[PDB]
Amino acid sequence: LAFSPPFYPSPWANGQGEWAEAYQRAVAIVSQMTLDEKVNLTTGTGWELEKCVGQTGGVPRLNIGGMCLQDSPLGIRDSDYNSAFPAGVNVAATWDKNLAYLRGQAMGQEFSDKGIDVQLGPAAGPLGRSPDGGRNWEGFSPDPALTGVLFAETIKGIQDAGVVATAKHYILNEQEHFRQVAEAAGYGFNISDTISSNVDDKTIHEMYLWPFADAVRAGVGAIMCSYNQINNSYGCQNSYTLNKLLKAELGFQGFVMSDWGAHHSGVGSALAGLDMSMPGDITFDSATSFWGTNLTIAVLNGTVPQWRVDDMAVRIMAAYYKVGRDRLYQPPNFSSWTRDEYGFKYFYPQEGPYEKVNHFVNVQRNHSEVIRKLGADSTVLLKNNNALPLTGKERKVAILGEDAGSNSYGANGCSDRGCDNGTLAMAWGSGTAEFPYLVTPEQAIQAEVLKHKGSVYAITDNWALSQVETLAKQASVSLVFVNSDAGEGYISVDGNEGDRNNLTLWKNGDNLIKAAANNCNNTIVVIHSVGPVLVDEWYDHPNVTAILWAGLPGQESGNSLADVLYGRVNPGAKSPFTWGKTREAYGDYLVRELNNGNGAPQDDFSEGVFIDYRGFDKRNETPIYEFGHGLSYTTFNYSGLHIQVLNATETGAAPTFGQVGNASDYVYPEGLTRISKFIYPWLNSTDLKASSGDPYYGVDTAEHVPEGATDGSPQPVLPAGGGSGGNPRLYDELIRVSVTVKNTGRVAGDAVPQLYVSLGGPNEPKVVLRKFDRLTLKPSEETVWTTTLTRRDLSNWDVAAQDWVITSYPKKVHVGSSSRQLPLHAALPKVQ
Amino acid sequence: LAFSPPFYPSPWANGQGEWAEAYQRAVAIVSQMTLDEKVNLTTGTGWELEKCVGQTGGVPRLNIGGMCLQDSPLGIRDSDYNSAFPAGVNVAATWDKNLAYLRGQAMGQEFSDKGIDVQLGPAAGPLGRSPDGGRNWEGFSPDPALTGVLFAETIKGIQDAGVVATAKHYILNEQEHFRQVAEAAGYGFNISDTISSNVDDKTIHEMYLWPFADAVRAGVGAIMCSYNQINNSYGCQNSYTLNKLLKAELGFQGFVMSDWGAHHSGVGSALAGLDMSMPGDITFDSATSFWGTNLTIAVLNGTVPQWRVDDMAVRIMAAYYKVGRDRLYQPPNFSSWTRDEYGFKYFYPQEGPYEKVNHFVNVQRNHSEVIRKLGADSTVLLKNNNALPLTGKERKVAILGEDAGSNSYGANGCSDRGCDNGTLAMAWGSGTAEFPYLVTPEQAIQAEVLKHKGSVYAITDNWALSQVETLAKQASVSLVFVNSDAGEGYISVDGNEGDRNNLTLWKNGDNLIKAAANNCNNTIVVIHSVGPVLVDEWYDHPNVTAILWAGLPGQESGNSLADVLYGRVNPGAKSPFTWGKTREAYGDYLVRELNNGNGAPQDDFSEGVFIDYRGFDKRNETPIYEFGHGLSYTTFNYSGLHIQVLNVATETGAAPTFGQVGNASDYVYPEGLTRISKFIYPWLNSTDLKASSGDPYYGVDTAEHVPEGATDGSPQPVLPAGGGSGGNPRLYDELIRVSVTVKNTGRVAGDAVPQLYVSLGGPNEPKVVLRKFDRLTLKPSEETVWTTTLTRRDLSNWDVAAQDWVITSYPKKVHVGSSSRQLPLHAALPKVQ
Ligand SMILES: *[C@@H]1O[C@H](CO)[C@@H](O[C@@H]2O[C@H](CO)[C@@H](O[C@@H]3O[C@H](CO[C@H]4O[C@H](CO[C@H]5O[C@H](CO)[C@@H](O)[C@H](O)[C@@H]5O[C@H]5O[C@H](CO)[C@@H](O)[C@H](O)[C@@H]5O)[C@@H](O)[C@H](O[C@H]5O[C@H](CO)[C@@H](O)[C@H](O)[C@@H]5O[C@H]5O[C@H](CO)[C@@H](O)[C@H](O)[C@@H]5O)[C@@H]4O)[C@@H](O)[C@H](O[C@H]4O[C@H](CO)[C@@H](O)[C@H](O)[C@@H]4O[C@H]4O[C@H](CO)[C@@H](O)[C@H](O)[C@@H]4O)[C@@H]3O)[C@H](O)[C@H]2NC(C)=O)[C@H](O)[C@H]1NC(C)=O
Ligand SMILES: *[C@@H]1O[C@H](CO)[C@@H](O[C@@H]2O[C@H](CO)[C@@H](O[C@@H]3O[C@H](CO[C@H]4O[C@H](CO)[C@@H](O)[C@H](O)[C@@H]4O)[C@@H](O)[C@H](O[C@H]4O[C@H](CO)[C@@H](O)[C@H](O)[C@@H]4O[C@H]4O[C@H](CO)[C@@H](O)[C@H](O)[C@@H]4O[C@H]4O[C@H](CO)[C@@H](O)[C@H](O)[C@@H]4O)[C@@H]3O)[C@H](O)[C@H]2NC(C)=O)[C@H](O)[C@H]1NC(C)=O
Ligand SMILES: *[C@@H]1O[C@H](CO)[C@@H](O[C@@H]2O[C@H](CO)[C@@H](O[C@@H]3O[C@H](CO[C@H]4O[C@H](CO[C@H]5O[C@H](CO)[C@@H](O)[C@H](O)[C@@H]5O[C@H]5O[C@H](CO)[C@@H](O)[C@H](O)[C@@H]5O)[C@@H](O)[C@H](O)[C@@H]4O)[C@@H](O)[C@H](O[C@H]4O[C@H](CO)[C@@H](O)[C@H](O)[C@@H]4O)[C@@H]3O)[C@H](O)[C@H]2NC(C)=O)[C@H](O)[C@H]1NC(C)=O
Ligand SMILES: *[C@@H]1O[C@H](CO)[C@@H](O[C@@H]2O[C@H](CO)[C@@H](O[C@@H]3O[C@H](CO[C@H]4O[C@H](CO)[C@@H](O)[C@H](O)[C@@H]4O)[C@@H](O)[C@H](O[C@H]4O[C@H](CO)[C@@H](O)[C@H](O)[C@@H]4O)[C@@H]3O)[C@H](O)[C@H]2NC(C)=O)[C@H](O)[C@H]1NC(C)=O
Ligand SMILES: *[C@@H]1O[C@H](CO)[C@@H](O)[C@H](O)[C@H]1NC(C)=O
Ligand SMILES: *[C@@H]1O[C@H](CO)[C@@H](O)[C@H](O)[C@H]1NC(C)=O
């Protein structure tokens, strides 16, 4: 079986780069803390014991309120009077750094105004190994350069608005199936440990880790480690991914929290680089924790060095100070577990004062504007045979498909969005927010038609084909809506356990489109979906005159779409993944059956880097719509490529901050009423063994602590580390590339120039994206797009050097409008 | 068994009153026609043979195009790019003569622009004997005064727009069960003839006949006789209702058409006062007709007098001229049977030239505006505990109920509206039109809330009660939508064979309302229905803060309602029927089982005049909401009632004939004409009359089957109650002027609906009966004096001994106020005669 080698000690923070001020403030306050106070920062207080999806107890003697951590990557979960933004995959479809940022900012503002300290998002893991993976839509794209840039801009927007962002899930959680042992049991499978993603060192560096290096360099304050194992070592105690890759090589200065139920040991995880346990207990409301009491004991008994807990507390306070949360602090003014105005303060056991638990604060501001805009700018026009934009003069409009209409249970009528009923504007699981309302395509397109005194109807039963056919024969234009949904693995909809069982349109979508197109010579298909779907049965039908993919647009869905269909917005989005002829064309199959008996299922990433377009190009397969493809209401020309060549070895010793006293300093204080299931830092008595309750307490302890796990002496800086996101020399700019871009059509709009490189060598993809931008040009207007290639951009990861190297194979650059339409190309000059 | 006494001969037209010019022009043209041409005017061409629901062949030699007759009373049926107006019941709820006229005008304009000559509406029969009758909603109100006045204004709007209106159904078609034998057989019932409505002479004059007297006096061109029998004689050959009540007593000058399949004999119907057979065949596509060829033969063989057939022709041409149809004529520019651009000219057999059958003419103009306004102005506010109007500042709005949302088959996705899915804006059967679009309450209310930056959702599955209760707990206001549907008897939805099986909300509505009100202290109920529904289980719930009934609003439903809920329109509508505690409180049970073996079921109207509020008041029962009840966002005061007393041929001419009849050979099929399969023609196969009729009863006991008087063309007496239009003109003398001051005593402009009831006196008269009303717009503090007059008819009762209206010697009283039960002003009336 795959093996995960050790890397110890867990590196300590050092005030790196833009962290210097936040780290000095964190060390000044952590220095004042007792051991039980430090431990309070590191451990949640128990599932649904307070207000937020995750919440720590804070340090009240030092005026630090408990840290409130809340989903989701696309808006506040489990709350009220908040907005529901389009999903991360829509941000990927915009290819628009500025919109990713502005969406970050608007979410940060709403979370901050609910008294939330830490947003659990954005996501870049899953990256998207498999097109049917259940959570790819929360992240961005299976391409690392596109994902890493939009991930980083999202982070910066959220943190500039004063909320800590949490880059998740770290790392290789590329499928829902078998990701948790209790979930698998509920779905009929008996496994002893979760699925192990088994991945070679070059692949992890070139693909899955690269957006985390961007998040790190962009200043992300938190990282959430993942439920799966990596080479048979759990993500939240994997010393290789956490100590070596994240903290030593990428130089991460913030804190690593567990995913909920992903914490699997106290001592093991603390020494392997975990800093925060969520929701704080061992299983939900077990009243036991691998940390809390147990971590205070682990330090008192000498097994976890003081410097390790001290560094947890410094990383946690430093992220909180880095975003300025201290200046915006207020306790969470809502409850994730009830919408009632009043309730017992501690929800799960219904204890504590009976008091106001919701204040109904309306944090929406004018955020519907950025959502409606980001929806229109993420609507990919895949096909347009001169059918769009509409004019408003069409005499009779047929709106067809359940995906155009209302969810009959209300927009929030399925818990965590766990159904696919009515228009699909948000997929399911934790990656969700309550809509404040939901504008359906039916509502916005019928309003638009009635404004022009046209005739219009909506048929929203996809087996009502008699009516579809009759109305399609009478219509000037048939707008046909179809979807495909997916989500987090703890929910199953129609037997899809988070992951999609296939890429075919749900709810009779293919037959609905063929019924319309058999009868209307102007059939326009609109797809809402978590990722690609199969279109081969109808996309080339002669009466299908346009096709659009609008992703998961959030609350302004129908208005975002109408703006595009009626020409208020000229679509600029590009596909952020590949649209293949068959599921086989993508390869990268999910592990859907036990393959290691009743042990952990083994998920070998045997394709290496060759996911999505890199795999189609390697196999010489032709996509229907390639990565980077999207049309516009105008045309663009690219010409005039020009290329120009441009002109610490050790750490400190681990520090300790403050003093640790005797056990009797950490016994429960006598005036305090202990709330049932609440997780505390304190001991029942000075008897360490008895207060831990651990059946393994004090047995074979040293043989269970890896060599070096307690070494606080100065360490070597890795060749590829020493900076933020990697050695700073990786970010030196080596080549500048320019091209001229002209709008040669009649409509103002945006181009998305894309710069790919070919790094050369027998095992490298033919082309890999490295730069892009989204440039607004009026008709006939031109501009020069200039960008630069860094040392990292031209490197490959060398497993023998443990470093990025520019290999000696000759490299080329290609610029154009998609991964398959690259009219400009040149050999690059040799650089090192 | 009830018996229907004979009345012969069938009165001939005479140019009465406003018909003088139309009659002269009809005589002049019918004088030029051959017998087969005349017959062509009287008989439709066969079910689906041409474009319109009914269609005659016309007279091409004299450039008279075939007459195109199309449904419905609320908009053009079976067509395209037309509007869908609110139902006649909503017009009744407006209590607004002007809006009634404006709706008729906007409908006549649309019909005229499609090349339709005759609109099959409006309807005042069923009047509304039973609250569960399947078609009451197409008419107006169970009250004859409210109905007759709004029926009349609807007819004047249509005919002023140049289309002939058809007052239907004449008469006593008060229920759908057993109305047609083949329908009854499709539902498992074996009957040899249709339901017989059996009614006494005073009741028919005081109730069912009264709105038709108004129709006739307002100048209606056509009348459509009914499927039921009346005292065991079919509506379309009932000499008593057609010859005596309609043509002699009411003096009707236009033409009587059959309902479709209501024509039951050639000779018998022509002599009993029928003028036009629709759709022209005996059963759909039978290629046989009681008229056409048979009527030509019946005149040739001496059995139907030429004067009778000339009179049919003159009544038909006179109605056509009277509305100026000849000045707007164009062939129908759509087909009722297909939406294809091209097709065979003769749809049913797919014969004739292949040519353009649809021109897709957009006739809607800006009629959405009158629809929008009339839906708002017909929304009755039944209860409002200071909950409405909404301000727009409600922080979270729950829209609850399938009736708020879309029909998932599309607004037109159920044929003839034969389902109750999504918002109910139109009930089912022939009384329907294709929506151009349908704005749902969900759409218009969610749009209003988003304009104010509120939060809003719609739950539209009425068994999703977990979600309903969760959202209702979170909401500032919960708007709960519920409905109850019905329609014409040939369609059954959920076992309701046209008629409603109960007056309970459909689709779990009572449980939905209780789920919302148990959780939300500001639950507002909105009812779309064909008539009253039982509200006893929740109307008085402490968290039910407002209740509205919005009827069947047509295509602008959601916008009409939002205009009211948000106070752009202050509701002025008033209930046009009673809301009782139980079904038993209304009495008047439908006949739902065979009670005459396998012969015609018998429907005895044994309550006499005591239907709807007259029955409740007679039984001393308290309605939840009485007839005439509606609240406003302002208040009104009525004061200062004052009463002021104010200051005909005896024989007809002889029956004329116009033009000449020749030999049987003039009427044989023309040699060079292709005869279209199933098409009905006026021509004979040969000069053999017997063989050309194909009638198994031809020449059988003929004399015995021709009623006494039926061929009598000599001068007739004028009935004491006849001699004018809608009755002897002395009935319309104004005898009393009544005035009262109405003041808006509140803070917002609005419409008051003053109502004037009389008590006629006498042991068997209703305690009060509506006579006058108007709808008056007043600004805050403004006053106005409402003045109206009572006519001799208004103060009379029908005396069966005299056969005339008589002001009886019991002391009479006037009562004025805001409903049938809120009448603060009363005055004794002085003796007048
Ligand atoms: C010139 O050319 C013309 C065009 O071709 C020729 O016209 C044909 O003339 C024939 C006579 O020669 C006609 O045939 C006879 O028709 C009658 C009338 O039938 C209709 O009306 C019935 C009710 O009638 C009353 O009311 C009408 C007006 O509404 C009056 O006109 C009648 O006079 C009669 O009036 C009395 O009652 C009213 C009150 O109700 C009073 O106010 C009056 O004061 C009078 O008292 C109605 O019931 C009939 O309905 C039947 O038919 C419908 C289908 O059309 C169907 O939907 C109904 O369910 C019902 O079906 C049942 O009956 C029919 C037959 O009629 C069966 O086939 C069927 O299967 C069912 O049983 C209809 O709407 C009709 O009554 C005559 O039939 C009676 O007499 C014959 C024998 O003479 C019997 O064989 C029949 O069974 C029947 O017997 C019943 O009645 C008897 C009373 O008379 C009684 O003794 C018996 O006990 C029995 O119960 C004839 O069928 C033919 O209609 C007409 N064709 C056209 C196309 O117009 C003309 O002949 C020719 N001239 C010359 C000189 O050659
Ligand atoms: C790890 O994080 C966890 C989670 O955040 C931290 O746990 C929290 O620690 C808090 C202390 O920082 C502790 O706070 C206590 O709350 C109690 C309940 O308060 C609520 O109910 C009261 C009473 O109705 C309301 O007044 C109040 O507003 C709340 O609604 C308080 O009662 C405690 O107040 C006492 O201590 C504080 C100072 O901490 C005094 O300011 C206050 O006056 C009270 O002082 C009395 O009691 C203390 C000790 O209990 C005495 O030392 C003092 O002399 C006073 O004694 C008199 O009164 C008591 C009875 O009232 C009487 O017996 C005595 O004889 C005298 O007459 C305090 O505010 C949270 O409950 C606790 N959270 C949970 C879930 O357990 C933990 O500290 C963190 N750990 C570290 C190491 O940082
Ligand atoms: C007066 O005249 C009116 C008009 O004719 C008469 O009304 C009819 O009354 C009938 C008798 O009540 C009604 O028939 C009943 O219909 C009930 C509801 O059927 C619908 O809803 C259910 C439940 O839907 C939920 O669950 C679905 C499947 O899980 C889900 O898809 C759906 O979205 C709903 O979800 C919510 O709830 C679930 C859990 O419950 C949650 O998980 C979810 O999150 C949501 O919260 C659905 O199954 C069904 O297919 C349909 O769409 C039925 O439930 C009744 O059937 C039960 O009881 C029967 C005994 O009565 C028994 O045979 C049967 O086996 C069931 O146990 C029943 O069919 C009818 O609809 C009314 N028609 C109209 C037009 O209103 C009225 O009866 C007359 N009144 C009187 C006094 O005479
Ligand atoms: C009772 O009402 C019915 C239905 O309205 C009338 O029946 C129609 O009568 C009209 C007028 O006579 C008939 O019209 C004839 O149609 C023929 C076919 O016309 C179409 O197809 C041709 C061939 O492709 C086209 O070229 C043409 O434009 C039409 O689109 C015409 O060809 C006839 O006109 C000429 O033909 C005859 C040949 O016999 C010659 O005498 C002349 O040269 C003449 O120019 C004619 O127009 C129509 O077909 C009838 N309809 C049906 C359904 O049968 C009755 O006439 C009316 N009865 C009374 C007594 O008024
Ligand atoms: C600590 O004491 C508490 C309360 O007495 C007891 O419930 C708990 O089990 C003890 N913990 C351990 C590890 O024994
Ligand atoms: C008249 O002639 C047609 C065509 O020959 C024949 O089919 C039809 O049956 C006849 N009508 C009658 C009453 O015989």
Ligand SMILES: OC[C@H]1CNC[C@@H](O)[C@@H]1O
């Ligand atoms: O559709 C034509 C006729 C059918 N029977 C009912 C009438 O109201 C209608 O106009």
Ligand code: NA
């Ligand atoms: Na086809």
Ligand code: NA
């Ligand atoms: Na309650």
